[PDB]
Write a protein that holds these residues in place. Structure first.
Motif, PDB file in Angstrom:
ATOM      1  N   UNK A   1       9.348  18.336  92.259  1.00 44.14           N
ATOM      2  CA  UNK A   1       8.213  19.194  92.575  1.00 44.14           C
ATOM      3  C   UNK A   1       8.127  20.233  91.470  1.00 44.14           C
ATOM      4  N   UNK A   2       7.030  20.235  90.723  1.00 43.43           N
ATOM      5  CA  UNK A   2       6.873  21.179  89.629  1.00 43.43           C
ATOM      6  C   UNK A   2       5.779  22.168  90.008  1.00 43.43           C
ATOM      7  N   UNK A   3       6.131  23.456  90.049  1.00 40.78           N
ATOM      8  CA  UNK A   3       5.236  24.514  90.488  1.00 40.78           C
ATOM      9  C   UNK A   3       4.870  25.408  89.313  1.00 40.78           C
ATOM     10  N   UNK A   4       3.608  25.812  89.257  1.00 47.00           N
ATOM     11  CA  UNK A   4       3.139  26.768  88.261  1.00 47.00           C
ATOM     12  C   UNK A   4       3.332  28.189  88.792  1.00 47.00           C
ATOM     13  N   UNK A   5       4.158  28.980  88.107  1.00 48.26           N
ATOM     14  CA  UNK A   5       4.269  30.416  88.409  1.00 48.26           C
ATOM     15  C   UNK A   5       2.955  31.099  88.046  1.00 48.26           C
ATOM     16  N   UNK A   6       2.471  32.062  88.832  1.00 45.59           N
ATOM     17  CA  UNK A   6       1.252  32.778  88.441  1.00 45.59           C
ATOM     18  C   UNK A   6       1.370  33.268  87.005  1.00 45.59           C
ATOM     19  N   UNK A   7       0.273  33.165  86.260  1.00 45.67           N
ATOM     20  CA  UNK A   7       0.328  33.428  84.830  1.00 45.67           C
ATOM     21  C   UNK A   7       0.706  34.886  84.575  1.00 45.67           C
ATOM     22  N   UNK A   8       1.535  35.096  83.553  1.00 45.07           N
ATOM     23  CA  UNK A   8       2.024  36.414  83.224  1.00 45.07           C
ATOM     24  C   UNK A   8       3.211  36.879  84.040  1.00 45.07           C
ATOM     25  N   UNK A   9       3.600  36.141  85.075  1.00 43.68           N
ATOM     26  CA  UNK A   9       4.695  36.553  85.942  1.00 43.68           C
ATOM     27  C   UNK A   9       5.959  35.776  85.610  1.00 43.68           C
ATOM     28  N   UNK A  10       7.092  36.324  86.043  1.00 46.34           N
ATOM     29  CA  UNK A  10       8.405  35.752  85.775  1.00 46.34           C
ATOM     30  C   UNK A  10       9.168  35.702  87.091  1.00 46.34           C
ATOM     31  N   UNK A  11       9.822  34.576  87.358  1.00 52.80           N
ATOM     32  CA  UNK A  11      10.810  34.479  88.427  1.00 52.80           C
ATOM     33  C   UNK A  11      12.180  34.681  87.784  1.00 52.80           C
ATOM     34  N   UNK A  12      12.841  35.807  88.010  1.00 48.62           N
ATOM     35  CA  UNK A  12      14.025  36.182  87.204  1.00 48.62           C
ATOM     36  C   UNK A  12      15.300  35.527  87.723  1.00 48.62           C
ATOM     37  N   UNK A  13      15.368  34.205  87.630  1.00 55.57           N
ATOM     38  CA  UNK A  13      16.492  33.474  88.201  1.00 55.57           C
ATOM     39  C   UNK A  13      17.580  33.225  87.159  1.00 55.57           C
ATOM     40  N   UNK A  14      18.746  32.824  87.652  1.00 55.92           N
ATOM     41  CA  UNK A  14      19.859  32.385  86.824  1.00 55.92           C
ATOM     42  C   UNK A  14      20.120  30.904  87.057  1.00 55.92           C
ATOM     43  N   UNK A  15      20.613  30.232  86.020  1.00 59.58           N
ATOM     44  CA  UNK A  15      20.951  28.820  86.154  1.00 59.58           C
ATOM     45  C   UNK A  15      21.940  28.629  87.298  1.00 59.58           C
ATOM     46  N   UNK A  16      21.671  27.639  88.151  1.00 62.29           N
ATOM     47  CA  UNK A  16      22.408  27.473  89.381  1.00 62.29           C
ATOM     48  C   UNK A  16      21.782  28.138  90.584  1.00 62.29           C
ATOM     49  N   UNK A  17      20.817  29.024  90.369  1.00 58.14           N
ATOM     50  CA  UNK A  17      20.155  29.724  91.441  1.00 58.14           C
ATOM     51  C   UNK A  17      19.088  28.887  92.123  1.00 58.14           C
ATOM     52  N   UNK A  18      18.444  29.513  93.104  1.00 60.05           N
ATOM     53  CA  UNK A  18      17.504  28.794  93.955  1.00 60.05           C
ATOM     54  C   UNK A  18      16.432  29.742  94.469  1.00 60.05           C
ATOM     55  N   UNK A  19      15.362  29.153  94.993  1.00 58.62           N
ATOM     56  CA  UNK A  19      14.335  29.902  95.698  1.00 58.62           C
ATOM     57  C   UNK A  19      14.285  29.368  97.125  1.00 58.62           C
ATOM     58  N   UNK A  20      13.486  30.019  97.963  1.00 55.47           N
ATOM     59  CA  UNK A  20      13.130  29.440  99.245  1.00 55.47           C
ATOM     60  C   UNK A  20      11.664  29.064  99.214  1.00 55.47           C
ATOM     61  N   UNK A  21      11.338  27.959  99.870  1.00 55.60           N
ATOM     62  CA  UNK A  21       9.963  27.515 100.055  1.00 55.60           C
ATOM     63  C   UNK A  21       9.616  27.682 101.526  1.00 55.60           C
ATOM     64  N   UNK A  22       8.389  28.104 101.806  1.00 56.16           N
ATOM     65  CA  UNK A  22       7.943  28.183 103.187  1.00 56.16           C
ATOM     66  C   UNK A  22       6.809  27.195 103.417  1.00 56.16           C
ATOM     67  N   UNK A  23       6.681  26.748 104.654  1.00 54.83           N
ATOM     68  CA  UNK A  23       5.558  25.888 104.982  1.00 54.83           C
ATOM     69  C   UNK A  23       4.762  26.516 106.113  1.00 54.83           C
TER      70      UNK A  23
END
Ligand SMILES: Cc1cc2nc3c(=O)[nH]c(=O)nc-3n(C[C@H](O)[C@H](O)[C@H](O)COP(=O)(O)OP(=O)(O)OC[C@H]3O[C@@H](n4cnc5c(N)ncnc54)[C@H](O)[C@@H]3O)c2cc1C
Ligand SMILES: Cc1ccccc1NC(=S)NCc1ccco1
Length: 279
Positions: free
Chosen positions: A23-45
């Motif tokens: 699943x490839x998601x586009x981050x809103x333009x100009x914004x950054x998700x400040x993650x580290x390798x090995x990290x994760x996000x949560x998805x909501x439905x």
């Protein structure tokens, strides 16, 4: 300190294996998700009802989907929920959040259980759909030493594996000895292999190894066969002068996690040198 959220647009949602979608998601333009390798996000439905029959399952994987009658499943969710998914991109791959998402079908012995909620929802997504992610979060982080690193992955564990390895070689320009050992059932279940082969050509200190437990005759496979814990031992650790001085990073299906960690403990590797990300 409420958790940050981003409403992202789906770029692509392609099968990379019979039961894994990228699943490839586009981050809103100009914004950054400040993650580290090995990290994760949560998805909501949101509340929803989705049919497996409407999933985009490509030619190479449909025969197995038909064989196990998976296109009959339907998933109905009346309340929003959240699940964690690990980044497959590394932090310098800006503008996107890449996930590898296994479809959590009902157990074979309980085939009329409800399908997995959030994975079924994710597999229903199409380009242009919107999804809300939150975080980022993390615990499965690289130790910053000069020690040799051994990465072992299976299934959707490829996501943190790819993130970690690209982070070491492309951002940190690491000279440490690094090896990646990935177990899969057959050749069609392998993905990203060209990326890792290129990384191995460009980085003498990086090596990449795939074990196939049940290769098909038509895979024309002359590589290692069997389970990755045995392949890692037989083709590398068995004549390593000091496996205990290595850092091991594990992320695979539960049976593979257990078998690899048992192999390592039997070699005398200490718990401190074994880091597990258990999905
Ligand atoms: C930190 C972290 C990172 C993660 N990263 C990833 C990742 O990168 N990729 C990934 O694919 N997953 C990842 N996971 C796992 C992910 O969060 C989900 O747990 C996974 O997608 C399954 O969730 P689901 O909502 O689809 O299934 P759930 O709805 O939680 O169901 C789980 C399973 O239980 C079965 N089940 C439900 N009810 C019954 C019943 N009554 N009887 C029998 N069986 C039943 C379902 O059919 C399904 O197989 C991660 C988890 C964590 C904690
Ligand atoms: C789970 C899995 C996914 C993909 C490819 C192979 C496997 N099987 C494994 S890792 N079996 C471990 C094992 C062998 C003997 C005892 O435990």
């Amino acid at each position: 300190g409420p958790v940050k959220k981003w409403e992202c647009e789906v770029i692509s949602n392609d099968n990379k294996a019979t039961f894994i979608k990228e699943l490839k998601l586009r981050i809103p333009e100009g914004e950054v998700v400040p993650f580290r390798a090995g990290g994760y996000i949560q998805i909501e439905c949101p509340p929803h009802k989705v049919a497996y029959a409407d999933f985009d399952v490509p030619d190479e994987y449909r025969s197995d989907w038909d064989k196990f009658n998976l296109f009959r499943y339907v998933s109905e969710v009346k309340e929003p929920t959240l699940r964690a998914y690990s980044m497959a991109n590394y932090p310098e791959e800006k503008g996107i959040i890449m996930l590898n998402v296994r479809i959590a079908t009902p157990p074979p012995k309980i085939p009329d259980a409800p399908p997995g909620i959030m994975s079924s929802y994710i597999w229903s997504l199409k380009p242009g759909d919107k999804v809300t992610i939150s975080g980022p979060f993390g615990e499965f982080f690289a130790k910053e030493t000069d020690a040799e690193m051994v990465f072992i992955g299976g299934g959707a564990g490829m996501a943190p594996m790819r993130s970690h390895i690209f982070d070491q070689l492309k951002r940190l320009h690491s000279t440490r000895k690094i090896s990646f050992w990935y177990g899969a059932r057959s050749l069609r279940e392998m993905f990203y292999d060209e990326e890792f082969e290129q990384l191995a050509r460009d980085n003498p200190n990086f090596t990449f190894h795939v074990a196939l437990s049940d290769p098909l005759p038509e895979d024309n496979w002359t590589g290692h066969t069997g389970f990755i814990h045995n392949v890692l031992y037989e083709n590398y650790l068995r004549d390593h002068p000091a496996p205990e001085d290595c850092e091991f990073y594990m992320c695979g299906p539960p049976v593979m996690n257990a078998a690899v960690i048992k192999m390592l403990k039997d070699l005398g590797v200490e718990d401190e040198n074994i880091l597990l990300d258990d999905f």
